[PDB]
């Protein structure tokens, strides 16, 4: 019954509801992704407006759409669930009908579509979410990293970040990542991510979670210690000067 | 019908399934694997109508894997079978029912015990030490009813199967081209590639 | 406050429906048309303004028939007029199909009445921009009716609507007084042509074209028909003569 | 046509209030007073029959209604809204309970049902909340007697006694003073009539007052005999004559 | 029970020349052992130099021709009066017929 | 004033006007001029095709609806496509079901009723296009003028579009002359080109600029463009 | 049309905020306080009854603590009516999970479904969100004792200790000040009441203005148990914890 | 507010007009047709150095003989491209032949006005118009090489050359002079590559600019970087040549 | 915010203006009417005002026959008056069919009242500017008068009046009854009850009537009918030979 056109054009040719959707993304926690030479890493910050949570149960920021693909986001959480679901369901459907898991690019193109659709369908508001999707195409070793936004647009990045202060960390990355020689190591790759997050996290050992993805469905999320260590080795790099 | 056998020994569940695919007068294939893995510790064997058979199995698989990803957890064999029964039970009163029968064998990582479930297209579910769908039941239940022990090792179980398969080849009308055997246990699912003479 | 005239189903504080009232405006602004109830039928006539010599004469017919015994003429937004007649036609057809007998003028009246009133109930629709004079002969005589955008309607001896509505109503009333015993179908056709010619003064700027149609028990066998040829010119004359 | 009002007409204001529900309650305030009192062996509900013209016959209109043979309701607010709410409450009792368990719903649940109805008129597309508050009183085997108040918000709560409408604040205060956990039904009936008199301007008699009770089973009101387990309705509206008699012992 | 189909007999023949082609048919329409007509054309010119004939059950045969022809009419509208190649008509007709694959046009047709 | 009564077609202004409909009518005036006129044996359409750049094509103004009917448009191209396409179906349906050619007069009644529907229901919008339908049927040649308001009128000739008033006066004057141009299509056409050049200003009608269409007694509605019209410029 | 009265309850603010969700929350900030504390051997749910009276039948009442499952319960803050509508669908969801899998619905799973339902009224429909926030207290064999919270937005998170309703900020500070990972149910029971006691907008924290609930695993059994204290049970524990 | 399908007093559809604005903001796109083929060129426009420029797809294939370039809100283009591809493939399934480039275009254009909140004419479900314009280029045996411009208005034109996007008005002006009925494919390539360099804020290189074409012989192809680079180098030399 | 006066939603005062404005429209016709209960009949008098000379007097009326036994007089514009009449007629026929007996006047009222209530709560339905007076000689209840309004309210009366000078007619009647002490006109024939009604209609409005200034409706056991100009005339002559 309800079909009010909520996303429409304004005189200057803008669709404010989609634009405002982005503002919701800017306010969200920061999320970053950097691809190495044989892996991709995704890092996300943990807000601190309230601390007394049960990190065990509380939903994490990086999700698995399938065994070889993960998706992190910045924006409204309630909205991210709906997108993550649709992605996961499509992941299975693609295996079932094409007898082959989805490619990172494909899963991305799907999500982007869902979002786009929500920007020109009656009675609905766009998703206040922007995503980072990374993994490895089936039987492939070249890492994949894509990003989507409420507008419904998407593209691949050698590294990228979304969320609050993403402006800052993007800069950091723009002047700390060389496509010529990408982080040839899982370790040096995670370091670059932790480094990039620190620029905005402001000492948050327990506020920074990292997830490493390797070829052939090898996905793992580091613990506070493994991370705390990276933070440690990094802080010295500064002082030793 | 085709041969769908299942026997639960001490620490694993063994599933045997005929490799023959006959269409009318000709045997089209002799290497058919009538099984689908629902999760790392749950295997399901199936037999029935031409299309319904796989269509149903894959469908069930898709849904089980989706639950795995969504919950980052593997549903117990018991749960998985309850899902399956519900589905068939719905199917039976639908416009065009799935005519498939299945055996579900999995290792409950929590209880640390193997399990075997037998479910027919009507949604009839029963858990048994050993079971089979179709005619095989008529020649094998007496064998197992005789030589079956709960504490049998996986090897004893295989031998017991070897015994069933022989009887089936001796007294059965059809040439089912042998069976493919698979074992489910604490370490997952694996296929005994050497049963064509074990 | 105010703004009680921006939505169709809203009651103003004094209990009115401005949208309907604004519709009436579109009507009064239209051409003039009348209906005269003679002693065994009804006569319909309308003013057809000749916007230019380009209009093929006798071609853009206005009066419409519903079924075979009912006649409709309206002033205002023509398209709305047709829309209404279409509904009347379906309405009449539905009726006959079930009761066999061709729809009685009264019943048809309320059929159009309820439909029109229906468009003053929701803000998702616009009221009809037309007043309609219609009628015919049925099992018990002739009947003349006029329907307003408000959905209101009553039985009339004579009726007029549009630009020259007053001149007409003036003339119609004169007839009613000087003919207590009734007017004949033949006579009503003449009188109508005159009354249209007089009412044309409130538009004496553009030239027009007359269009009469009648439904008489003795003249057309209870069937609605257009007055053409000789009988038509004859009336055009009877009018042209008394306009001087 | 087609109700294009597929959106809520009751929304949250920046202050966090729900306008229409508030206004609805205001509407309730304006309505005639009505009260409820729970005794140890019954419940009583009553209101005033504010005849809106001497020509109108107040009998041909009941503010006190039977929902089930052991549950009654009374209101304060917009009479017409109450009316349709009663019919809905009578049906819902059958459709969602008697037809499934073959027994009338227990007070709390039937109330729970009505509440849901109202709750929905607070969120559904194109509608306004109900401009009434209800006082439902009943009895069931496993819950005994009970009294509930249902608000246009869709909220409801149990009461030992309470009043709504016009002089509710006044009457509520008068009840806190006269109520105790040992009242017999006749007691509550008396207290009821007293509590009512205060809110009554002009005439106060059995023709201007409307009161019913939920007490013992009235087999005499069953209509048939022969079935041991069917003892009769506990709900009973008092007659004009019954009211006046009590008014003399006022 | 009601039988939706019938047989009007008839026979048609199509022969292709090097720079021409022919489509022929008897002009007799029958029902059982009676003759409905000694002359009821069965081969039609559908324009764009295409002749068609759907033989078998008359009703279904005429419906098809009517439909195909109408399909040609629109082809022109939609694609700027561009002539419909015989091969295209063939593919098109296949779709016309296979559309009723589960309540077929009881006709064997040739163009 | 007007600002409070033109937010949709389901609203009447205090004076009885339907602005949204009027705004639509405007789109027509903003449209390229097109002329229609008929004799007793033929009906003709002449339209000025407008182009974007000099690198672009000139947009078609004339559409065929059947072998005996067609029209010219001025205003929103899309809406003409929608309406003409719908007028094609009606002709089609008239054939397939009654084996009868849809009379021009009726085609008009149909268009009117279609249009009218988009001016009394919420959510709908009027059609922003004007049409001139010509056609030869059982009662001869015909010319119709379609207005988004729903008003369809039969005339001997007419024009619509920017500067249309020029041609219209010219026809209104030439009336008694072209109406008798029977048995001669070329003459009726030249009278048509003249009427239209009466609304020129910007430039002069060229070969890839002029568009002509004609229907008649033994003439199936046929459109002429480019080189084909050369013999009239 | 109708667009004239459409609040567009589901749009973004120029700042990328959701008006109604925000306002809905504003409403909840005035609701009786509800606190949930999770200890090593159990969970505690304590809430303050908003608006009470001498006449209010307290034994038969429930406005904040609702049983959803046998191992799950919730504490409400906001529109009770709204809460129920959601609670009932929650109760059903639990059962379906059971009927499909023959296993008790995992706590988080039930919580995710409920949050998703809310989230919906946030993205489409043109209806108002539910003016409710939930503190879910439950236990399952996969994560043991769990404590969750969800609100009008549709988002949910887990906690060791948390509160909803009025003076949450005050309570959160007090909890954050005295909570310890190795707490014991009894300890939590006390900390809960102490907090309310210090945040209550009322004079004194009496039993008649409270609702209490505990999810403990009675050792002499091995199964988990839900206990929703009765008036007297609260009155007792209230004297014990030293608040008499 | 005001209906999404409301008329302005000047006789225009607000949403459609505003739609055209969003497009002016879009990336530049240019198309030039020659009797040797049609060339399609676009401005990648990477919003950062980290963005892998080749994951930018603004020139897509509809069929082997029909390709197109997009400008404006490109996310809107997906459903259109899908529609176009389907229509082209379907026509082939139903008529055993390729679809005419014009009809393909006409087909896309038909989605355009399918929007509103309850427009009385069918079931137009799509809340707003498309925020993207398309340059459809292709070839068929009826009208040879063709270049089409399709806007959200629902209308479309055929240009010998046309440029849409931020640098259009100027670029189009350029094309008005540069284009002539005897251009070669090679010529049109550099010409597109040139006008792109002029209107692009960025220094045109084979990584923020992309060329492609459609020829009767090899159909729609997208020039791989290496091929484009050389063409660029070639352009520079002929420019610095005078 | 200020649209709480355009649709049927609450005002801060907790009022429904649109419902009030509906009531306002009921007087739009400037006609008064009253109903009285005989010993075993029920009569309804209504003013009839046909100003236009071109109108056919016979087609003008605000009195309707809903069924053989139920009659209904409407105070309000006619198009809303007819929408209401039709609906009641349908509701009457359906009731008979489904339950096997003639719908009782009061029930018909209740059903129409509940129907009005809905326009009061649902935003897209406007109320009907009319007050409906239903009369009959119920087989179970005896002579009956039940009136409903745009608010969705209704009740039974001993007698009642509606229109502009409603109050004058009401208090007139109130007085007559305070005097007689009974709730009805103690008359056997309806002609006398009709005369009574007309009489007080005159006393209260201080106006004289002609056969064409009234509209009368009578409801007797198993039949409700309206009088004719002559039936009325004969009745007017009667009151005349008493004054």
PDB file of N, CA and C in Angstrom, chain H residues 166-215:
ATOM      1  N   UNK H 166      29.620  16.521 -17.989  1.00  0.00           N
ATOM      2  CA  UNK H 166      30.102  17.828 -17.570  1.00  0.00           C
ATOM      3  C   UNK H 166      30.710  18.711 -18.674  1.00  0.00           C
ATOM      4  N   UNK H 167      31.576  18.156 -19.518  1.00  0.00           N
ATOM      5  CA  UNK H 167      32.191  18.980 -20.548  1.00  0.00           C
ATOM      6  C   UNK H 167      31.447  19.135 -21.864  1.00  0.00           C
ATOM      7  N   UNK H 168      30.241  18.589 -21.934  1.00  0.00           N
ATOM      8  CA  UNK H 168      29.420  18.619 -23.146  1.00  0.00           C
ATOM      9  C   UNK H 168      29.266  19.922 -23.962  1.00  0.00           C
ATOM     10  N   UNK H 169      28.463  20.870 -23.469  1.00  0.00           N
ATOM     11  CA  UNK H 169      28.215  22.137 -24.172  1.00  0.00           C
ATOM     12  C   UNK H 169      29.420  22.665 -24.945  1.00  0.00           C
ATOM     13  N   UNK H 170      30.604  22.552 -24.349  1.00  0.00           N
ATOM     14  CA  UNK H 170      31.808  23.011 -25.011  1.00  0.00           C
ATOM     15  C   UNK H 170      32.241  21.978 -26.025  1.00  0.00           C
ATOM     16  N   UNK H 171      32.340  20.737 -25.564  1.00  0.00           N
ATOM     17  CA  UNK H 171      32.749  19.622 -26.412  1.00  0.00           C
ATOM     18  C   UNK H 171      31.845  19.479 -27.635  1.00  0.00           C
ATOM     19  N   UNK H 172      30.544  19.624 -27.415  1.00  0.00           N
ATOM     20  CA  UNK H 172      29.576  19.508 -28.492  1.00  0.00           C
ATOM     21  C   UNK H 172      29.876  20.601 -29.507  1.00  0.00           C
ATOM     22  N   UNK H 173      30.210  21.782 -28.996  1.00  0.00           N
ATOM     23  CA  UNK H 173      30.529  22.916 -29.843  1.00  0.00           C
ATOM     24  C   UNK H 173      31.733  22.547 -30.699  1.00  0.00           C
ATOM     25  N   UNK H 174      32.701  21.885 -30.080  1.00  0.00           N
ATOM     26  CA  UNK H 174      33.889  21.453 -30.788  1.00  0.00           C
ATOM     27  C   UNK H 174      33.437  20.544 -31.934  1.00  0.00           C
ATOM     28  N   UNK H 175      32.713  19.487 -31.576  1.00  0.00           N
ATOM     29  CA  UNK H 175      32.211  18.512 -32.537  1.00  0.00           C
ATOM     30  C   UNK H 175      31.461  19.149 -33.691  1.00  0.00           C
ATOM     31  N   UNK H 176      30.784  20.259 -33.411  1.00  0.00           N
ATOM     32  CA  UNK H 176      30.021  20.959 -34.437  1.00  0.00           C
ATOM     33  C   UNK H 176      30.927  21.364 -35.584  1.00  0.00           C
ATOM     34  N   UNK H 177      32.171  21.700 -35.253  1.00  0.00           N
ATOM     35  CA  UNK H 177      33.160  22.115 -36.250  1.00  0.00           C
ATOM     36  C   UNK H 177      33.953  20.934 -36.787  1.00  0.00           C
ATOM     37  N   UNK H 178      34.515  20.149 -35.877  1.00  0.00           N
ATOM     38  CA  UNK H 178      35.338  19.004 -36.242  1.00  0.00           C
ATOM     39  C   UNK H 178      34.690  17.940 -37.129  1.00  0.00           C
ATOM     40  N   UNK H 179      33.462  17.545 -36.803  1.00  0.00           N
ATOM     41  CA  UNK H 179      32.782  16.501 -37.564  1.00  0.00           C
ATOM     42  C   UNK H 179      32.428  16.825 -39.011  1.00  0.00           C
ATOM     43  N   UNK H 180      32.600  15.828 -39.867  1.00  0.00           N
ATOM     44  CA  UNK H 180      32.272  15.957 -41.270  1.00  0.00           C
ATOM     45  C   UNK H 180      32.030  14.560 -41.834  1.00  0.00           C
ATOM     46  N   UNK H 181      31.108  14.486 -42.787  1.00  0.00           N
ATOM     47  CA  UNK H 181      30.686  13.241 -43.430  1.00  0.00           C
ATOM     48  C   UNK H 181      31.732  12.300 -44.009  1.00  0.00           C
ATOM     49  N   UNK H 182      33.008  12.610 -43.847  1.00  0.00           N
ATOM     50  CA  UNK H 182      34.036  11.743 -44.404  1.00  0.00           C
ATOM     51  C   UNK H 182      35.131  11.375 -43.415  1.00  0.00           C
ATOM     52  N   UNK H 183      34.872  11.613 -42.133  1.00  0.00           N
ATOM     53  CA  UNK H 183      35.832  11.271 -41.094  1.00  0.00           C
ATOM     54  C   UNK H 183      36.141   9.789 -41.194  1.00  0.00           C
ATOM     55  N   UNK H 184      37.326   9.396 -40.757  1.00  0.00           N
ATOM     56  CA  UNK H 184      37.682   7.989 -40.795  1.00  0.00           C
ATOM     57  C   UNK H 184      37.539   7.523 -39.361  1.00  0.00           C
ATOM     58  N   UNK H 185      37.638   6.220 -39.140  1.00  0.00           N
ATOM     59  CA  UNK H 185      37.521   5.727 -37.785  1.00  0.00           C
ATOM     60  C   UNK H 185      38.697   6.287 -36.990  1.00  0.00           C
ATOM     61  N   UNK H 186      39.901   6.132 -37.542  1.00  0.00           N
ATOM     62  CA  UNK H 186      41.122   6.620 -36.899  1.00  0.00           C
ATOM     63  C   UNK H 186      40.998   8.086 -36.516  1.00  0.00           C
ATOM     64  N   UNK H 187      40.483   8.888 -37.449  1.00  0.00           N
ATOM     65  CA  UNK H 187      40.297  10.316 -37.221  1.00  0.00           C
ATOM     66  C   UNK H 187      39.378  10.532 -36.019  1.00  0.00           C
ATOM     67  N   UNK H 188      38.205   9.901 -36.042  1.00  0.00           N
ATOM     68  CA  UNK H 188      37.242  10.039 -34.947  1.00  0.00           C
ATOM     69  C   UNK H 188      37.826   9.641 -33.589  1.00  0.00           C
ATOM     70  N   UNK H 189      38.744   8.679 -33.593  1.00  0.00           N
ATOM     71  CA  UNK H 189      39.378   8.224 -32.359  1.00  0.00           C
ATOM     72  C   UNK H 189      40.160   9.356 -31.707  1.00  0.00           C
ATOM     73  N   UNK H 190      41.092   9.931 -32.462  1.00  0.00           N
ATOM     74  CA  UNK H 190      41.894  11.035 -31.956  1.00  0.00           C
ATOM     75  C   UNK H 190      40.997  12.217 -31.583  1.00  0.00           C
ATOM     76  N   UNK H 191      40.016  12.510 -32.438  1.00  0.00           N
ATOM     77  CA  UNK H 191      39.089  13.610 -32.188  1.00  0.00           C
ATOM     78  C   UNK H 191      38.396  13.456 -30.837  1.00  0.00           C
ATOM     79  N   UNK H 192      37.967  12.235 -30.526  1.00  0.00           N
ATOM     80  CA  UNK H 192      37.306  11.965 -29.252  1.00  0.00           C
ATOM     81  C   UNK H 192      38.335  12.131 -28.143  1.00  0.00           C
ATOM     82  N   UNK H 193      39.499  11.536 -28.370  1.00  0.00           N
ATOM     83  CA  UNK H 193      40.599  11.574 -27.421  1.00  0.00           C
ATOM     84  C   UNK H 193      41.042  13.015 -27.161  1.00  0.00           C
ATOM     85  N   UNK H 194      40.909  13.854 -28.187  1.00  0.00           N
ATOM     86  CA  UNK H 194      41.272  15.265 -28.098  1.00  0.00           C
ATOM     87  C   UNK H 194      40.252  16.033 -27.256  1.00  0.00           C
ATOM     88  N   UNK H 195      39.001  16.077 -27.719  1.00  0.00           N
ATOM     89  CA  UNK H 195      37.927  16.766 -26.997  1.00  0.00           C
ATOM     90  C   UNK H 195      37.807  16.305 -25.542  1.00  0.00           C
ATOM     91  N   UNK H 196      38.244  15.078 -25.267  1.00  0.00           N
ATOM     92  CA  UNK H 196      38.201  14.560 -23.903  1.00  0.00           C
ATOM     93  C   UNK H 196      39.268  15.262 -23.091  1.00  0.00           C
ATOM     94  N   UNK H 197      40.449  15.383 -23.693  1.00  0.00           N
ATOM     95  CA  UNK H 197      41.586  16.026 -23.055  1.00  0.00           C
ATOM     96  C   UNK H 197      41.261  17.478 -22.702  1.00  0.00           C
ATOM     97  N   UNK H 198      40.536  18.154 -23.590  1.00  0.00           N
ATOM     98  CA  UNK H 198      40.151  19.542 -23.371  1.00  0.00           C
ATOM     99  C   UNK H 198      39.244  19.743 -22.169  1.00  0.00           C
ATOM    100  N   UNK H 199      38.118  19.032 -22.133  1.00  0.00           N
ATOM    101  CA  UNK H 199      37.150  19.172 -21.044  1.00  0.00           C
ATOM    102  C   UNK H 199      37.450  18.440 -19.734  1.00  0.00           C
ATOM    103  N   UNK H 200      38.459  17.580 -19.727  1.00  0.00           N
ATOM    104  CA  UNK H 200      38.781  16.854 -18.504  1.00  0.00           C
ATOM    105  C   UNK H 200      39.664  17.646 -17.552  1.00  0.00           C
ATOM    106  N   UNK H 201      39.251  17.706 -16.291  1.00  0.00           N
ATOM    107  CA  UNK H 201      40.027  18.410 -15.280  1.00  0.00           C
ATOM    108  C   UNK H 201      41.376  17.717 -15.213  1.00  0.00           C
ATOM    109  N   UNK H 202      41.338  16.398 -15.343  1.00  0.00           N
ATOM    110  CA  UNK H 202      42.536  15.582 -15.272  1.00  0.00           C
ATOM    111  C   UNK H 202      43.347  15.555 -16.543  1.00  0.00           C
ATOM    112  N   UNK H 203      44.629  15.219 -16.411  1.00  0.00           N
ATOM    113  CA  UNK H 203      45.495  15.132 -17.577  1.00  0.00           C
ATOM    114  C   UNK H 203      45.189  13.785 -18.202  1.00  0.00           C
ATOM    115  N   UNK H 204      44.520  13.806 -19.350  1.00  0.00           N
ATOM    116  CA  UNK H 204      44.126  12.581 -20.036  1.00  0.00           C
ATOM    117  C   UNK H 204      45.249  11.599 -20.316  1.00  0.00           C
ATOM    118  N   UNK H 205      45.081  10.385 -19.797  1.00  0.00           N
ATOM    119  CA  UNK H 205      46.039   9.304 -19.995  1.00  0.00           C
ATOM    120  C   UNK H 205      45.221   8.029 -20.206  1.00  0.00           C
ATOM    121  N   UNK H 206      45.881   6.925 -20.539  1.00  0.00           N
ATOM    122  CA  UNK H 206      45.152   5.689 -20.775  1.00  0.00           C
ATOM    123  C   UNK H 206      44.582   5.066 -19.509  1.00  0.00           C
ATOM    124  N   UNK H 207      44.484   5.833 -18.429  1.00  0.00           N
ATOM    125  CA  UNK H 207      43.934   5.282 -17.191  1.00  0.00           C
ATOM    126  C   UNK H 207      42.755   6.016 -16.583  1.00  0.00           C
ATOM    127  N   UNK H 208      42.394   7.152 -17.163  1.00  0.00           N
ATOM    128  CA  UNK H 208      41.244   7.905 -16.684  1.00  0.00           C
ATOM    129  C   UNK H 208      40.374   8.236 -17.892  1.00  0.00           C
ATOM    130  N   UNK H 209      40.728   7.624 -19.016  1.00  0.00           N
ATOM    131  CA  UNK H 209      40.006   7.795 -20.263  1.00  0.00           C
ATOM    132  C   UNK H 209      39.919   6.423 -20.911  1.00  0.00           C
ATOM    133  N   UNK H 210      38.807   6.150 -21.580  1.00  0.00           N
ATOM    134  CA  UNK H 210      38.627   4.864 -22.228  1.00  0.00           C
ATOM    135  C   UNK H 210      37.923   4.995 -23.580  1.00  0.00           C
ATOM    136  N   UNK H 211      38.473   4.325 -24.591  1.00  0.00           N
ATOM    137  CA  UNK H 211      37.896   4.338 -25.930  1.00  0.00           C
ATOM    138  C   UNK H 211      37.367   2.963 -26.305  1.00  0.00           C
ATOM    139  N   UNK H 212      36.479   2.938 -27.289  1.00  0.00           N
ATOM    140  CA  UNK H 212      35.887   1.698 -27.767  1.00  0.00           C
ATOM    141  C   UNK H 212      35.188   2.029 -29.066  1.00  0.00           C
ATOM    142  N   UNK H 213      34.723   1.003 -29.765  1.00  0.00           N
ATOM    143  CA  UNK H 213      34.018   1.222 -31.018  1.00  0.00           C
ATOM    144  C   UNK H 213      33.197   0.023 -31.459  1.00  0.00           C
ATOM    145  N   UNK H 214      32.462   0.233 -32.539  1.00  0.00           N
ATOM    146  CA  UNK H 214      31.627  -0.795 -33.109  1.00  0.00           C
ATOM    147  C   UNK H 214      31.815  -0.755 -34.612  1.00  0.00           C
ATOM    148  N   UNK H 215      32.260  -1.879 -35.164  1.00  0.00           N
ATOM    149  CA  UNK H 215      32.465  -2.009 -36.598  1.00  0.00           C
ATOM    150  C   UNK H 215      31.697  -3.232 -37.080  1.00  0.00           C
TER     151      UNK H 215
END
